[PDB]
Each structure stands twice: as structure tokens, then as C-alpha cells.
């Protein structure tokens, strides 16, 4: 069974360097190129380069050449990619991969990806603000100015699971912001309590915010 | 250097339909690859060397093409084929990918449920002022939103966020947030969220007045 195992999630400051590893098993490491790719978002895939583990000879995409260095450690069946001069533009998921087997291979192999976040921010807990209206009523929860991702938003501690939309976070003033909505019958709110629960594991946050009618 | 252009960037199909996605190359390509990807997953190889079926992928898929025009086909669409599809040329270096083709599931048109929310007293106490507008459970994905302050349009300070197609009802949802300083917000009185969607010639208007 061929597997490529990549190093864990990384967060670094601008200008810093980073070495991402790709560990291979299940085959003669020295016989196949290891390829490196970057995914800036769901609609972009780019080839960074390839390295021949037999002797470490690399081939680079000229766009990434100046700031990328590929090496190999055959004794550990591991490939490395070093990134220098990192900037927010380098935030992405980074993949290693191996071509299909020679002659009659029909399956390639990819690592699980390593997420890179290039930012100067400090771990910050979110501000949780309730969104109350000015048969079915829609309430909201505004989670603003936190870092890093992710956050988990629930409603009434999980008993309100249907009819809720939690939207992807957006980078606002170099921090993260998202909102969540929940729709319930008007005969339940405000006659009964509706509360959003926000947890930020990085900062060990678990805040509860009740939605109250504004009068 | 070889630029790959996949069209349509977005297309819809329901189970049973035949799907054809195209990848147009800026120059001659000898071997074309195809990958499938869903959110949270690695790219999954489907076609290697233009017309060879990758292992573990169903026989409804097929790759073809030559020179500068290539295609990926799903003889009969199934729901689990909802995903983005990438072409990748392995003919000359550097290796390049297309921007992908998003294949989404078809369903009945649905108008957005629009809800506008003023900034909370908590946030105003903090110094900020965010005006939030939810546009939930609509289809198709194309929607336009306009923020107006005292009857006047506003564009700066607007941040939009979209969910992925719901796996249960195949609808889309969107959030729009107008971020003003407390000073600007208190300077005006009327705030409006206007949603334009194909399901109506008239926009859906929601608004509030600070009082």
C-alpha cells in the first residue's frame, strides 16, 4: 500500500521560512519522482517542482524557483520543500504526490496536504454579537475579530441543528469574521430562549450569547 | 506557459443527464490528465494520458481530445459526481492546470429568504458597527446584492460569503456584511439590503431605521 504522509498544519509570520515534509512508504522511494503542488483555493492547482530521490536532482517551476528548495532524505524515505520569504500570498494547502506506477499503473498517490497560513496576527478570541430583528423568524450570531481558524458555532447547545447556516470566515482587518443564522417559528422566539454557542479551541474560548428582542 | 482554459466554469446537471466538460489548451498537448475534487479532499485522478481510466473510478467517465481541445464526459450523471474537475497537461514543462469546472446539482428555482440585522448594542458599545444581511436557501447560485444608506448606494466596506451547495436541498446561501465605524453608522438613519435574483424581476428589499 503506497502512502504519502505530510507534516501538520503550519502558521508562520511573513518573511519567515518553512520546511514541509512528505513521508513515503510502500514502494522503492528512489524509483519515482516526488511532485510538489500548491492549492491557493478551490479553483487553483499549481505545480511547484519535482525531485528525483535517487540523487536529489530537482526540477522547478520558474515562478516558484527563487523561493523554493526541494531536498530528499532517502534513508528516511522523506522529501522536503523549503519556502523562503513567505508572504500572505503564500498561504495555501501544499500537496506532495507520486505518479502512477510505471508500465501499467492506473493509480497515482497524493498526500493529505499541509495548510500554510502566513500572517502576523496573534491568537485572539472572538467577539460574539447577537443579531436580532429590527411565522418563521431568523436570528443570527456575529463572530468577529478572532484568530486563527477555526471556530465552531452551535445553537442552543446543539438542539437547534436544522435551519441554521454558518458561513465561511472572511479576513477582515487581518482577523477572521463569520456569521451564523438560525430560523425558528415565531411561536418559539422570544417566548423561549435562543442562544448561539461559539468555541475557539486555539484560545480555549467557549462563549454563550443569548438573542434577545430589541425594544 | 501552456495555458489551459476550462469552460463552462460552472455547469448544472441532474442524475441521468450526459455531462461534457472541455479543456482548451493554448498550444499542442500530447497527454491530458483529469482530476476530481470535493471540499476537504485531495484531488482524485480520473484520466491519465488523455483517455485512460484511472483505477477505482466508474465506467461512466471518459477522457478524449487531441492537439488543443480536450474533453471529459460523464455518460450518465449521478448525484455523487457533484464536484470541481481540473484538467492538467503533462506534455511540456512547467506542468499547468486549468481553473477547473464546477459541476453542481440541478433543482427547482428558489427565491432567497432575506433578513437584515442592525448592529448589536454590544458591538456599538465596543466601537464598531456591522450591518448583516442573510440571503438563504436560493437557487440558482447567481445572485446580486446592493447596500443602500439613506437611499444612496454603497459599495465600500461590504464583505460577502457564500456556502457550498447544500447536500440536502441543493440550495445556496449567502451572507453580506456592511462594516461601518460607529461614527458613520450614527450619521445616517436608513439601511437597506436589496437582493436581485432571477426568480423575480423586482428585487427583494429589506431595511431598518435606527429607532
Amino acid at each position: 500500500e503506497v502512502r504519502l504522509q505530510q507534516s501538520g498544519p503550519e502558521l508562520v509570520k511573513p518573511g519567515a521560512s518553512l520546511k514541509i515534509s512528505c513521508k513515503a512508504s510502500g514502494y522503492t522511494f528512489t524509483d519515482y519522482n516526488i511532485h510538489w503542488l500548491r492549492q491557493s483555493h478551490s479553483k487553483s492547482l499549481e505545480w511547484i517542482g519535482s525531485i528525483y530521490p535517487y540523487n536529489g536532482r530537482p526540477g522547478y517551476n520558474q515562478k516558484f524557483k527563487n523561493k523554493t528548495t526541494l531536498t530528499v532524505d532517502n534513508s528516511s524515505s522523506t522529501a522536503y520543500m523549503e519556502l523562503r520569504g513567505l508572504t500572505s500570498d503564500d498561504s495555501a494547502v501544499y500537496f506532495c504526490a507520486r505518479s502512477r506506477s510505471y508500465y501499467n499503473g492506473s493509480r497515482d498517490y497524493w498526500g493529505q496536504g499541509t495548510s500554510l497560513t502566513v500572517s502576523s496576527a496573534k491568537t485572539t478570541p472572538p467577539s460574539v454579537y447577537p443579531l436580532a430583528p429590527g411565522s418563521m423568524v431568523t436570528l443570527g450570531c456575529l463572530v468577529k475579530g478572532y484568530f486563527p481558524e477555526p471556530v465552531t458555532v452551535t445553537w442552543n447547545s446543539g438542539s437547534l441543528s436544522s435551519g441554521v447556516h454558518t458561513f465561511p470566515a472572511v479576513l477582515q482587518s487581518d482577523l477572521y469574521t463569520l456569521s451564523s443564522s438560525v430560523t425558528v417559528p415565531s411561536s418559539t422566539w422570544p417566548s423561549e430562549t435562543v442562544t448561539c454557542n461559539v468555541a475557539h479551541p486555539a484560545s480555549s474560548t467557549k462563549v454563550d450569547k443569548k438573542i434577545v428582542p430589541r425594544d | 506557459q501552456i495555458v489551459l482554459t476550462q469552460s463552462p466554469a460552472i455547469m448544472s446537471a441532474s442524475p441521468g443527464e450526459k455531462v461534457t466538460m472541455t479543456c482548451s489548451a493554448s498550444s499542442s498537448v500530447n497527454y491530458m490528465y483529469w482530476y476530481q475534487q470535493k471540499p476537504g479532499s485531495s484531488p482524485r485522478l480520473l484520466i491519465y494520458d488523455t483517455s485512460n481510466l484511472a483505477s477505482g473510478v466508474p465506467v461512466r467517465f471518459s477522457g478524449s481530445g487531441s492537439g488543443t481541445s480536450f474533453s471529459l464526459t460523464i455518460s450518465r450523471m449521478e448525484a455523487e459526481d457533484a464536484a470541481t474537475y481540473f484538467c492538467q497537461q503533462w506534455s511540456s514543462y512547467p506542468l499547468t492546470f486549468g481553473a477547473g469546472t464546477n459541476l453542481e446539482l440541478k433543482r427547482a428555482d428558489a427565491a432567497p429568504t432575506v433578513s437584515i440585522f442592525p448592529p448589536s448594542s454590544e458591538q456599538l458599545t465596543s466601537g464598531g458597527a456591522s450591518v448583516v444581511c442573510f440571503l438563504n436557501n436560493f437557487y440558482p447560485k447567481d445572485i446580486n446584492v446592493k447596500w443602500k444608506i439613506d437611499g444612496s448606494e454603497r459599495q465600500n466596506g461590504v464583505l460577502n460569503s457564500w456556502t457550498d451547495q447544500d447536500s440536502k436541498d441543493s440550495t445556496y446561501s449567502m451572507s453580506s456584511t456592511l462594516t461601518l465605524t460607529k461614527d458613520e453608522y450614527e450619521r445616517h438613519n436608513s439601511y437597506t439590503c436589496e437582493a436581485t435574483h432571477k426568480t423575480s424581476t423586482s428585487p427583494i428589499v429589506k431595511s431598518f431605521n435606527r429607532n
Binding site: 524509483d31 535517487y54 526540477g59 510505471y102 508500465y103 | 500530447n30 497527454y31 491519465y48 503533462w90
Partner: peptide
């Protein structure tokens, strides 16, 4: 690559590993 059949894009991989940024050709 050594002692291997080089079919399809595998040949392109091999030619890049040998010729680098000098370029290479394999058709027609």
C-alpha cells in the same frame, strides 16, 4: 526510471529529469 518502460507522460517526466531547462522534444 531506471530499467522501466516509459509510457505516456512517464517519458515526459524522464526527459525533463535529463534535459532540465534546456528543453526537450519527443514528437513527431
Amino acid at each position: 526510471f531506471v530499467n522501466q518502460h516509459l509510457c505516456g507522460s512517464h517519458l515526459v517526466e524522464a526527459l525533463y529529469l535529463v534535459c532540465g531547462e534546456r528543453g526537450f522534444f519527443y514528437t513527431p
